[PDB]
């Protein structure tokens, strides 16, 4: 009886989703189907394509500049995640430090999954679908730059297999956002109750959109906890960032 209404509420967030996320998974996999009216984006196999691809988008080296690109488009994505989380009923009624804490620990995970929406078996989409780069080239970068994005693939091959459509991610990223099992938290009640309702809606949205599917919900939550593993493992990265300041390089001619 109650669930009948929230579906609408669920779909409400769907609207804000595309209003907050300009590129949907359906359009990513679509532009990667080849059966699309739009032009096929260009691959990035070899440095030739890099030289001719920076056009279709202080820095000096580029093996760093790519990394700076990933994190830059990340700080662009968070600006979508802010307003999205705002559009969650009750979200602004929680404590400001509690909300910034919620996004504090979830951002890398949700950009992980969205990137998985732009990912595939071998490669990823760049610049709102206008580009495509390959993992094989990614393996060949100077260490540790070669190992930065591959785990992302190691998640995309597992996640995109469930082949969720945007109507599921629109609220799944909400349930990952409103997670109550984080340290340094203040108001316990609101995240518990709202995550309960969220889990109510998500349950039978999952069960409704795919009746042939067998227990995608549960194991997918298990993959949420796997995303928690990967935030446990981002501590290394945030320190490998230390390759970009005062490094005994003199530029007399450059
Ligand atoms: O300009 C971009 O949109 C982009 C960039 S930025 C860029 C990259 C190469 C030449 C010029 C800019 C980017 C960089 C990396 Cl190493 C990986 C993915 C990247 N992307 C695509 C991207 C799309 C979505 C998200 Cl969340 C993160 C990255």
12 is in an annotated binding site: no
For residue 111, give the ligand 1 atom closest to its CA.
Answer: 26
Residues with CB under 6 A from ligand 1: 54, 57, 66-67, 69-70, 72-74, 77, 111, 114-115, 118, 126-127
- Return the residue whose CA atom lies nearest to atom 11 of ligand 1: 54
For residue 114, give the ligand 1 atom closest to its CA.
Answer: 26
For residue 139, the domain's CATH number is: 1.10.565.10
Query: What is the DSSP secondary structure assignment for residue 41, as one 8-state letter?
Result: P
| Angle at alpha carbon of residue 18, lines to 87 and 228, rounded to 5° | 70
Q: Confirm if 5 and 145 have CB atoms less than 8 A apart.
A: no
Tell me how far apart the alpha carbons of residues 156 and 28 are, in angstroms, rounded to a whole number: 13
Q: Confirm if 227 and 109 have CB atoms less than 8 A apart.
A: yes
Per the listing, tokens 């700080």 go with 75
Q: Confirm if 164 and 156 have CB atoms less than 8 A apart.
A: no
Give me the resolution in angstroms, 1 decimal: 3.0
Tell me how far apart the alpha carbons of residues 193 and 178 are, in angstroms, rounded to a whole number: 10
Q: State the residue range of the domain holding 71.
A: 1-254
Could you give the number of structural domains in the chain?
1
């Amino acid at each position: 009886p109650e669930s009948a209404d929230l579906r609408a509420l669920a779909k409400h967030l769907y609207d804000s989703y595309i209003k907050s996320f300009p590129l949907t998974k359906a359009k990513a996999r679509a532009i990667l189907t080849g059966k699309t009216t739009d032009k096929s984006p260009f691959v990035i196999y070899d440095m030739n394509s890099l030289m001719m691809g920076e056009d279709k988008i202080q820095s000096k080296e580029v093996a760093i500049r790519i990394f700076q690109g990933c994190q830059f488009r990340s700080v662009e994505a968070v600006q979508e995640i802010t307003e999205y989380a705002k559009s969650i009923p009750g979200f602004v009624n929680l404590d400001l430090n509690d909300q910034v804490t919620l996004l504090k620990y979830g951002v890398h995970e949700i950009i992980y999954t969205m990137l998985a929406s732009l990912m595939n078996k071998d490669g990823v989409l760049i610049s709102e679908g206008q580009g495509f780069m390959t993992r094989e080239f990614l393996k060949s970068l100077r260490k540790p730059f070669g190992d930065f994005m591959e785990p992302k693939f190691e998640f995309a091959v597992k996640f995109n297999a469930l082949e969720l459509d945007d109507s599921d991610l629109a609220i799944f990223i909400a349930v990952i956002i409103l997670s109550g099992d984080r340290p340094g938290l203040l108001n316990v009640k609101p995240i518990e109750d709202i995550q309960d309702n969220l889990l109510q809606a998500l349950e039978l949205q999952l069960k409704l959109n795919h009746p042939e599917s067998s227990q995608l919900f549960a194991k997918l939550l298990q993959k949420m906890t796997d995303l928690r593993q990967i935030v446990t493992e981002h501590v290394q990265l945030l320190q490998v960032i230390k390759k970009t300041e005062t490094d005994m390089s003199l530029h007399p001619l450059l």
